Amino acid sequence: PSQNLVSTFANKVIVEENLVNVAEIDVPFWSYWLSSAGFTSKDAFVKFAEAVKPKVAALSTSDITNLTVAFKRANYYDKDLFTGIEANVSANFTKFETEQLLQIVATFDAFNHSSVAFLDDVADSITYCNHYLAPVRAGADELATLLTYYAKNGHERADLLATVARGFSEVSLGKLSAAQRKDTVLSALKAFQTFGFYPESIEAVIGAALVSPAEYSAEELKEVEAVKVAAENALGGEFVLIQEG
Amino acid sequence: MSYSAYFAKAGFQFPAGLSALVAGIVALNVCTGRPTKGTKEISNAEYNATPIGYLQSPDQHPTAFPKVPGMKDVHGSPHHH
Amino acid sequence: SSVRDVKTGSLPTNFLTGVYRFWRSQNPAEKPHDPVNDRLLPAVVDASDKRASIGTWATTFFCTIISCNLLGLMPFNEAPTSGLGFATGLGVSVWATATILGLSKTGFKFPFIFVPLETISYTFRAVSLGVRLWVNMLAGHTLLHILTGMALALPFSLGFFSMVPATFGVCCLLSALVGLEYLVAVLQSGVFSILSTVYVGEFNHDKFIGPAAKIVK
Amino acid sequence: MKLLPESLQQEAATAAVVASWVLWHLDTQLLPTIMREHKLHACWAAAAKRYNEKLFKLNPSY
Amino acid sequence: EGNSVAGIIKSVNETSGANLLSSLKTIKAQAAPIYPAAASSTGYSTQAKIALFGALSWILYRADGQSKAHEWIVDLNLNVLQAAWLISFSSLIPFRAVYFAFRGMAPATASTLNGLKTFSSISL
Amino acid sequence: EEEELWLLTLTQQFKHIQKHFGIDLPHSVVAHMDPLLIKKIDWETTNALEDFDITLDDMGAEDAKEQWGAENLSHHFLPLIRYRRDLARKNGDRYGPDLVNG
Amino acid sequence: TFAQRLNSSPAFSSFLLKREKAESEVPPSELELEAAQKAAELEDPEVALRTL
Amino acid sequence: VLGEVYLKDILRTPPTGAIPANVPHPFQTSFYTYATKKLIPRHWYLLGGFTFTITLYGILDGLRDSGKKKAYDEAIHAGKTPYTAGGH
Amino acid sequence: MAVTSFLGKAFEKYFYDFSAYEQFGLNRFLSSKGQYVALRHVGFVMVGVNVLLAANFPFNPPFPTIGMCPAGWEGTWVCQADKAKALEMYKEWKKS
Ligand SMILES: [Zn+2]
């Protein structure tokens, strides 16, 4: 009678409604570490969202980032919860790090959700409340996602554009795989052409297209050449590819 | 007025992880895995059969301020091999 | 969970700032070809990422060896560095750190008569860096032992407070040799960390990434 | 005279533990304090000219 | 707490014109930073007691091990030889010059903190 | 008296720092007065860039060191920037330093 | 002055520096001394108001 | 006007009520943060060097112990006592 | 009397104000203060060696003697190069 008793006890004491009842105390921690383990269920994440929705305004930056990354990984959008998340980020924008704000903005970009105050506070936090070399440690895909977030929302901050443009490099684009570097370069050039902002570091982006032009389409090469001509006129010179020397 | 009294309020303090350094050095000294510097593990029959004075050996008990260099505190076992 | 409060301008903070900035200045960063601006800033940050932490490592070894060396000059205490395995373990660890860094640069596996000769003289750095510290900490101590033995032998046999000029000369020589031991202690810690910088900095060279595309004029 | 220890590995591990503690205490307790105190002064000295010029431009008092 | 300049602005705006000039020493005293007064002088801390008890414990253990050694009197006079140079270091070292030389090793204390000038931050 | 609080707070804070730095100023008072500067210096220490001003001294990069100092104190102007952006937003305008061609 | 503020610092209350003075290493310049005097005259805010 | 809310967490005056606690560095807060962010990726060369020295000195201790065992067995087989007499 | 505060003040006034170079008038005999520090160093070493030898003087020396002997012992345990011989002779000497 070990089999039936053990089997009956295990299902009753081990199924997914009671391990949602262990996760009511610390919803950011548990939702993050369960979504990173592949457990992404809408049925559990609705209970996560309404369990954490009064707790959001007092959450730290680590817990807000963990919650926001978890709810990207589940792909469950709650309007009220993410409005609370955005109010938490807007209230404590000086305490957030660029490493966390890129992950938050990627989730706020995944489904469309934005405020003028949220975009202003994220831009103020990345430009003035964080280190100016924090986009260098970021990875070019996250900076491209933040750039297209600000491009799709139409919100233009030239100081944030300079700060995030500093993160684009031969190093950061070289860390990316080629299929990822294609999307990163195309989205970053589209954002830079939308804003009309052409910094020096766009040479690292356009060059990352023109060093390997075989992966790009003819249409994408045409849009890259348009951005190259505009950046040539804005920076007052001619774009050269530099070999080893 | 200065912050001198505020720093005089704080007492002496050890460096922040000195307990880990002491607990590393002590754990290296006590987890040798070998007997303790002039001892030998013996059988339990020998250890209970042997008196306390025969278990002690005179080289491990040197005299504190010896009038002759080589004076030992105990004489060890009177039984000699 | 509560960190202590620190006074700005404290003497340990100032001394340790000067020591760290001294050991950091041993292997300076290479000046790039381009003017350093926001275009070259990620390449500069990446070049700092490729560089080893020789300032922190040399400061670590300098502090941990000047402390163990000055322990031998405190009363009732002996130097841990005067033990063989301690000082030679520090030296073999520095050589292994430099070797592991150089192997990580070249791809994690090891490279007529010239190759054996230079490999013997390279592998001798492992012995030499630790043994030149160990026998130097054994140096003034064992000479001090024998000399204070004879300095005891004079008034033990001629009387407790009689013939004071001869024992005065031997105690003057003893005092001069403990002062020389102080100099040798500080100087051996310094020589060890200078050598650690020049051994690890042989493999501290990675190429600058730089801009692969520019807009000239 | 003592030359050879009872254990070479125990003494080398003592050296490794002491130097690893000094490395942790430098990197974690000493260097953050030193860099706060150093980089406040260094950032103010590097930014005095540009900071005073930017604040002079932003000031409407003159 | 709230910042001191906003307290200055509020309490200066709250005074009348007749009350203003004599209140200025009070308002200043409410904007002065807290410099904590000298509190109770306890004896030694439990970490200071642990430190000196462990140092005396170590010195007694080491002296007992030195006396049981073979050339024990040699070690006991080595202790005298080292304590002599500690005593001579107390006499010879110019501690003020050493303090001010250590102040020159760090760039934060080698110079006066030069930053914000008054003329850029004048408010009117 | 429109922006007197920000300018006088800058004056008060730097005056207290300059009076007490290197003599008896606690690190807690420094981290309380300028938490964002301490946050940026802590980012530099965390990301193995504690010798970054030494690195800029090694390369002779005077403009990059001047920019590094100016960007670590860039938050001092952020109260004024946020206040003037809200002033322009209440008037329906766009803030000048926010625009690319502005 | 800077030497006066150094004299009140905790490090000159330490044992090896009880009898030392910060003025003995680098003396204050007369601009520093007259500035300390002029600042002591202006710590009264009413006197500063009347003067300005 | 510019109120307190525009400089709420950005700029503070010297404290008037009490001296606050010191803000900890993330490495002082957590050993895991220091281990994953600085100790491994910057000091793994030192950690491997200490590992190499501990391994090599264990090998040398094994060689010393095997030599002592060989001399002990050679003394036992030759009918000699393996050590000589103590002083007392 | 706080146990450590009075000790600190007494050691401070001994360390700073008390000076045997001035109270015994040693500027007449000696050129410098640093020469007094050097002579006081070697005098402290000599006083320490003599009181450590006087605390126990009948013992057999572990240090090698320069062919000499203390006072009238001559051929006793104190002047025995053989240490086992010196231990057994010390027992007969202790018998009395
Ligand atoms: Zn010794």
Side-chain angles (χ1 to χ4, degrees), chain G residues 18-48:
Chain G
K18 292 181 93 65
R19 273 91 162 111
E20 302 303 311
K21 285 298 156 180
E23 299 99 350
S24 302
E25 197 80 14
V26 187
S29 66
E30 199 273 328
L31 183 60
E32 279 172 59
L33 280 173
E34 79 187 1
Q37 182 68 41
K38 190 176 287 285
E41 279 153 31
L42 293 170
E43 292 298 326
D44 205 64
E46 180 186 343
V47 170

mmCIF file of all heavy atoms in Angstrom, chain G residues 18-48:
data_model
loop_
_atom_site.group_PDB
_atom_site.id
_atom_site.type_symbol
_atom_site.label_atom_id
_atom_site.label_comp_id
_atom_site.label_asym_id
_atom_site.label_seq_id
_atom_site.Cartn_x
_atom_site.Cartn_y
_atom_site.Cartn_z
ATOM 1 N N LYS G 18 49.611 64.190 19.961
ATOM 2 C CA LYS G 18 48.932 65.029 20.946
ATOM 3 C C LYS G 18 49.603 66.389 21.066
ATOM 4 O O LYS G 18 48.933 67.420 21.178
ATOM 5 C CB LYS G 18 48.910 64.338 22.309
ATOM 6 C CG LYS G 18 48.049 63.107 22.380
ATOM 7 C CD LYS G 18 48.053 62.489 23.756
ATOM 8 C CE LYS G 18 46.896 63.011 24.573
ATOM 9 N NZ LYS G 18 45.596 62.585 23.996
ATOM 10 N N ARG G 19 50.930 66.408 21.049
ATOM 11 C CA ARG G 19 51.686 67.631 21.263
ATOM 12 C C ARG G 19 52.115 68.299 19.969
ATOM 13 O O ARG G 19 52.711 69.379 20.015
ATOM 14 C CB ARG G 19 52.916 67.343 22.122
ATOM 15 C CG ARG G 19 52.649 67.425 23.606
ATOM 16 C CD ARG G 19 52.242 66.081 24.147
ATOM 17 N NE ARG G 19 52.383 66.005 25.596
ATOM 18 C CZ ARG G 19 51.361 65.928 26.436
ATOM 19 N NH1 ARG G 19 50.120 65.914 25.971
ATOM 20 N NH2 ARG G 19 51.580 65.859 27.740
ATOM 21 N N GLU G 20 51.836 67.692 18.823
ATOM 22 C CA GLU G 20 52.160 68.319 17.556
ATOM 23 C C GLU G 20 51.063 69.293 17.156
ATOM 24 O O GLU G 20 49.919 69.194 17.603
ATOM 25 C CB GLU G 20 52.350 67.269 16.465
ATOM 26 C CG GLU G 20 53.434 66.257 16.769
ATOM 27 C CD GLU G 20 54.778 66.900 17.026
ATOM 28 O OE1 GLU G 20 55.197 67.750 16.214
ATOM 29 O OE2 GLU G 20 55.420 66.554 18.039
ATOM 30 N N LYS G 21 51.430 70.248 16.310
ATOM 31 C CA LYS G 21 50.504 71.239 15.788
ATOM 32 C C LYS G 21 50.555 71.199 14.271
ATOM 33 O O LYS G 21 51.616 70.953 13.689
ATOM 34 C CB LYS G 21 50.850 72.637 16.300
ATOM 35 C CG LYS G 21 50.459 72.872 17.745
ATOM 36 C CD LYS G 21 48.961 72.742 17.928
ATOM 37 C CE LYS G 21 48.609 72.402 19.363
ATOM 38 N NZ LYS G 21 47.139 72.266 19.550
ATOM 39 N N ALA G 22 49.409 71.435 13.633
ATOM 40 C CA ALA G 22 49.357 71.393 12.177
ATOM 41 C C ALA G 22 49.974 72.643 11.567
ATOM 42 O O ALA G 22 50.352 72.644 10.390
ATOM 43 C CB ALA G 22 47.915 71.223 11.712
ATOM 44 N N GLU G 23 50.084 73.718 12.352
ATOM 45 C CA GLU G 23 50.715 74.937 11.862
ATOM 46 C C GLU G 23 52.222 74.775 11.723
ATOM 47 O O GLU G 23 52.860 75.530 10.980
ATOM 48 C CB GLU G 23 50.404 76.106 12.799
ATOM 49 C CG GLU G 23 48.929 76.438 12.935
ATOM 50 C CD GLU G 23 48.315 75.858 14.190
ATOM 51 O OE1 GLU G 23 48.982 75.038 14.851
ATOM 52 O OE2 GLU G 23 47.166 76.223 14.517
ATOM 53 N N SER G 24 52.809 73.803 12.426
ATOM 54 C CA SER G 24 54.258 73.634 12.400
ATOM 55 C C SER G 24 54.732 73.042 11.080
ATOM 56 O O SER G 24 55.868 73.284 10.658
ATOM 57 C CB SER G 24 54.702 72.758 13.567
ATOM 58 O OG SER G 24 54.300 73.326 14.797
ATOM 59 N N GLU G 25 53.886 72.253 10.416
ATOM 60 C CA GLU G 25 54.295 71.676 9.140
ATOM 61 C C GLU G 25 54.163 72.689 8.016
ATOM 62 O O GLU G 25 55.160 73.090 7.406
ATOM 63 C CB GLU G 25 53.472 70.428 8.836
ATOM 64 C CG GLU G 25 54.088 69.558 7.756
ATOM 65 C CD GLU G 25 55.221 68.689 8.273
ATOM 66 O OE1 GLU G 25 55.368 68.559 9.506
ATOM 67 O OE2 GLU G 25 55.969 68.132 7.442
ATOM 68 N N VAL G 26 52.938 73.112 7.721
ATOM 69 C CA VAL G 26 52.702 74.185 6.758
ATOM 70 C C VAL G 26 51.986 75.314 7.486
ATOM 71 O O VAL G 26 50.838 75.136 7.919
ATOM 72 C CB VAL G 26 51.889 73.705 5.546
ATOM 73 C CG1 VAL G 26 51.821 74.804 4.498
ATOM 74 C CG2 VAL G 26 52.494 72.446 4.947
ATOM 75 N N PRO G 27 52.615 76.473 7.651
ATOM 76 C CA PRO G 27 51.961 77.583 8.340
ATOM 77 C C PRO G 27 50.878 78.187 7.469
ATOM 78 O O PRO G 27 50.964 78.133 6.234
ATOM 79 C CB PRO G 27 53.106 78.581 8.579
ATOM 80 C CG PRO G 27 54.369 77.830 8.268
ATOM 81 C CD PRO G 27 53.986 76.814 7.250
ATOM 82 N N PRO G 28 49.829 78.747 8.071
ATOM 83 C CA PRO G 28 48.793 79.400 7.268
ATOM 84 C C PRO G 28 49.300 80.707 6.682
ATOM 85 O O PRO G 28 50.000 81.477 7.343
ATOM 86 C CB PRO G 28 47.661 79.632 8.273
ATOM 87 C CG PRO G 28 48.330 79.659 9.592
ATOM 88 C CD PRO G 28 49.488 78.720 9.503
ATOM 89 N N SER G 29 48.949 80.944 5.422
ATOM 90 C CA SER G 29 49.259 82.216 4.790
ATOM 91 C C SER G 29 48.394 83.319 5.387
ATOM 92 O O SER G 29 47.384 83.055 6.045
ATOM 93 C CB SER G 29 49.044 82.128 3.282
ATOM 94 O OG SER G 29 47.676 81.934 2.977
ATOM 95 N N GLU G 30 48.805 84.570 5.164
ATOM 96 C CA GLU G 30 48.101 85.682 5.794
ATOM 97 C C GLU G 30 46.752 85.919 5.132
ATOM 98 O O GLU G 30 45.826 86.431 5.769
ATOM 99 C CB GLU G 30 48.959 86.950 5.762
ATOM 100 C CG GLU G 30 48.536 88.024 6.777
ATOM 101 C CD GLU G 30 47.465 88.971 6.257
ATOM 102 O OE1 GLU G 30 47.455 89.247 5.038
ATOM 103 O OE2 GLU G 30 46.614 89.409 7.062
ATOM 104 N N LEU G 31 46.612 85.540 3.859
ATOM 105 C CA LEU G 31 45.295 85.569 3.234
ATOM 106 C C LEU G 31 44.359 84.566 3.893
ATOM 107 O O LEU G 31 43.183 84.866 4.117
ATOM 108 C CB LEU G 31 45.409 85.302 1.734
ATOM 109 C CG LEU G 31 44.093 85.374 0.955
ATOM 110 C CD1 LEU G 31 43.464 86.746 1.074
ATOM 111 C CD2 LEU G 31 44.310 85.024 -0.503
ATOM 112 N N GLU G 32 44.885 83.400 4.279
ATOM 113 C CA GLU G 32 44.091 82.414 5.007
ATOM 114 C C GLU G 32 43.713 82.924 6.395
ATOM 115 O O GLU G 32 42.582 82.731 6.852
ATOM 116 C CB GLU G 32 44.864 81.102 5.119
ATOM 117 C CG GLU G 32 44.808 80.221 3.887
ATOM 118 C CD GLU G 32 45.753 79.035 3.982
ATOM 119 O OE1 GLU G 32 45.611 78.234 4.930
ATOM 120 O OE2 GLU G 32 46.642 78.907 3.115
ATOM 121 N N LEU G 33 44.643 83.607 7.066
ATOM 122 C CA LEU G 33 44.377 84.105 8.413
ATOM 123 C C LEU G 33 43.383 85.257 8.397
ATOM 124 O O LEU G 33 42.456 85.303 9.217
ATOM 125 C CB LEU G 33 45.681 84.540 9.075
ATOM 126 C CG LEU G 33 46.546 83.428 9.661
ATOM 127 C CD1 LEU G 33 47.876 83.985 10.123
ATOM 128 C CD2 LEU G 33 45.821 82.752 10.806
ATOM 129 N N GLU G 34 43.543 86.191 7.457
ATOM 130 C CA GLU G 34 42.611 87.306 7.374
ATOM 131 C C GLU G 34 41.272 86.856 6.808
ATOM 132 O O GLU G 34 40.239 87.461 7.100
ATOM 133 C CB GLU G 34 43.210 88.451 6.552
ATOM 134 C CG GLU G 34 43.164 88.292 5.042
ATOM 135 C CD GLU G 34 43.937 89.382 4.328
ATOM 136 O OE1 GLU G 34 44.521 90.244 5.018
ATOM 137 O OE2 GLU G 34 43.959 89.381 3.080
ATOM 138 N N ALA G 35 41.255 85.749 6.062
ATOM 139 C CA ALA G 35 39.989 85.195 5.608
ATOM 140 C C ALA G 35 39.262 84.489 6.737
ATOM 141 O O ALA G 35 38.032 84.532 6.809
ATOM 142 C CB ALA G 35 40.231 84.239 4.450
ATOM 143 N N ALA G 36 40.007 83.837 7.632
ATOM 144 C CA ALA G 36 39.395 83.251 8.818
ATOM 145 C C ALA G 36 38.848 84.332 9.741
ATOM 146 O O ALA G 36 37.750 84.191 10.291
ATOM 147 C CB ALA G 36 40.413 82.380 9.549
ATOM 148 N N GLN G 37 39.591 85.433 9.888
ATOM 149 C CA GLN G 37 39.115 86.585 10.652
ATOM 150 C C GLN G 37 37.871 87.206 10.021
ATOM 151 O O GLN G 37 36.896 87.511 10.720
ATOM 152 C CB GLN G 37 40.230 87.622 10.752
ATOM 153 C CG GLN G 37 39.879 88.839 11.572
ATOM 154 C CD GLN G 37 39.718 88.513 13.038
ATOM 155 O OE1 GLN G 37 40.492 87.740 13.599
ATOM 156 N NE2 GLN G 37 38.707 89.099 13.667
ATOM 157 N N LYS G 38 37.887 87.374 8.698
ATOM 158 C CA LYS G 38 36.777 87.991 7.985
ATOM 159 C C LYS G 38 35.548 87.098 7.995
ATOM 160 O O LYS G 38 34.416 87.588 8.014
ATOM 161 C CB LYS G 38 37.221 88.293 6.557
ATOM 162 C CG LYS G 38 36.288 89.133 5.733
ATOM 163 C CD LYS G 38 36.919 89.405 4.385
ATOM 164 C CE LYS G 38 38.053 90.406 4.487
ATOM 165 N NZ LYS G 38 37.557 91.792 4.676
ATOM 166 N N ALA G 39 35.751 85.781 7.988
ATOM 167 C CA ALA G 39 34.630 84.859 8.089
ATOM 168 C C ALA G 39 34.076 84.831 9.502
ATOM 169 O O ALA G 39 32.867 84.677 9.692
ATOM 170 C CB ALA G 39 35.059 83.465 7.649
ATOM 171 N N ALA G 40 34.945 84.986 10.507
ATOM 172 C CA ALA G 40 34.479 85.076 11.887
ATOM 173 C C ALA G 40 33.688 86.355 12.120
ATOM 174 O O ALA G 40 32.783 86.390 12.961
ATOM 175 C CB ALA G 40 35.663 85.004 12.848
ATOM 176 N N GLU G 41 34.019 87.419 11.386
ATOM 177 C CA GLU G 41 33.236 88.647 11.479
ATOM 178 C C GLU G 41 31.867 88.489 10.828
ATOM 179 O O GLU G 41 30.922 89.203 11.179
ATOM 180 C CB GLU G 41 33.998 89.804 10.839
ATOM 181 C CG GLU G 41 35.059 90.407 11.736
ATOM 182 C CD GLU G 41 36.184 91.051 10.955
ATOM 183 O OE1 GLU G 41 35.921 91.562 9.846
ATOM 184 O OE2 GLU G 41 37.331 91.045 11.450
ATOM 185 N N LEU G 42 31.739 87.564 9.881
ATOM 186 C CA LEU G 42 30.507 87.407 9.120
ATOM 187 C C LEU G 42 29.670 86.207 9.536
ATOM 188 O O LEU G 42 28.703 85.889 8.840
ATOM 189 C CB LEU G 42 30.814 87.285 7.631
ATOM 190 C CG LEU G 42 31.387 88.501 6.923
ATOM 191 C CD1 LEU G 42 31.828 88.061 5.567
ATOM 192 C CD2 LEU G 42 30.362 89.606 6.818
ATOM 193 N N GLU G 43 30.009 85.522 10.631
ATOM 194 C CA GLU G 43 29.160 84.418 11.068
ATOM 195 C C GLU G 43 27.868 84.935 11.679
ATOM 196 O O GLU G 43 26.871 84.209 11.743
ATOM 197 C CB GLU G 43 29.893 83.513 12.058
ATOM 198 C CG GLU G 43 31.045 82.718 11.465
ATOM 199 C CD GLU G 43 30.614 81.742 10.381
ATOM 200 O OE1 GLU G 43 29.499 81.187 10.470
ATOM 201 O OE2 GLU G 43 31.398 81.529 9.432
ATOM 202 N N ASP G 44 27.868 86.173 12.145
ATOM 203 C CA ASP G 44 26.625 86.841 12.488
ATOM 204 C C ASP G 44 25.914 87.216 11.197
ATOM 205 O O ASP G 44 26.466 87.994 10.410
ATOM 206 C CB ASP G 44 26.891 88.083 13.329
ATOM 207 C CG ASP G 44 25.705 88.462 14.188
ATOM 208 O OD1 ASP G 44 25.344 87.671 15.080
ATOM 209 O OD2 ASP G 44 25.136 89.550 13.976
ATOM 210 N N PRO G 45 24.725 86.691 10.927
ATOM 211 C CA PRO G 45 24.075 86.963 9.638
ATOM 212 C C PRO G 45 23.532 88.378 9.538
ATOM 213 O O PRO G 45 23.408 88.925 8.438
ATOM 214 C CB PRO G 45 22.953 85.921 9.586
ATOM 215 C CG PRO G 45 22.702 85.561 10.995
ATOM 216 C CD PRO G 45 23.966 85.735 11.749
ATOM 217 N N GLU G 46 23.214 88.980 10.686
ATOM 218 C CA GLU G 46 22.749 90.362 10.698
ATOM 219 C C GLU G 46 23.873 91.321 10.330
ATOM 220 O O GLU G 46 23.655 92.297 9.603
ATOM 221 C CB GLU G 46 22.173 90.701 12.072
ATOM 222 C CG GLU G 46 21.647 92.116 12.206
ATOM 223 C CD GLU G 46 21.219 92.444 13.622
ATOM 224 O OE1 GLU G 46 21.029 91.503 14.420
ATOM 225 O OE2 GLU G 46 21.074 93.643 13.938
ATOM 226 N N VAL G 47 25.089 91.043 10.808
ATOM 227 C CA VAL G 47 26.255 91.850 10.455
ATOM 228 C C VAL G 47 26.566 91.714 8.969
ATOM 229 O O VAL G 47 26.911 92.695 8.300
ATOM 230 C CB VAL G 47 27.451 91.448 11.341
ATOM 231 C CG1 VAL G 47 28.752 92.067 10.858
ATOM 232 C CG2 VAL G 47 27.192 91.855 12.771
ATOM 233 N N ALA G 48 26.389 90.510 8.418
ATOM 234 C CA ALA G 48 26.592 90.302 6.988
ATOM 235 C C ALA G 48 25.541 91.032 6.162
ATOM 236 O O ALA G 48 25.863 91.612 5.117
ATOM 237 C CB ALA G 48 26.583 88.809 6.669
#
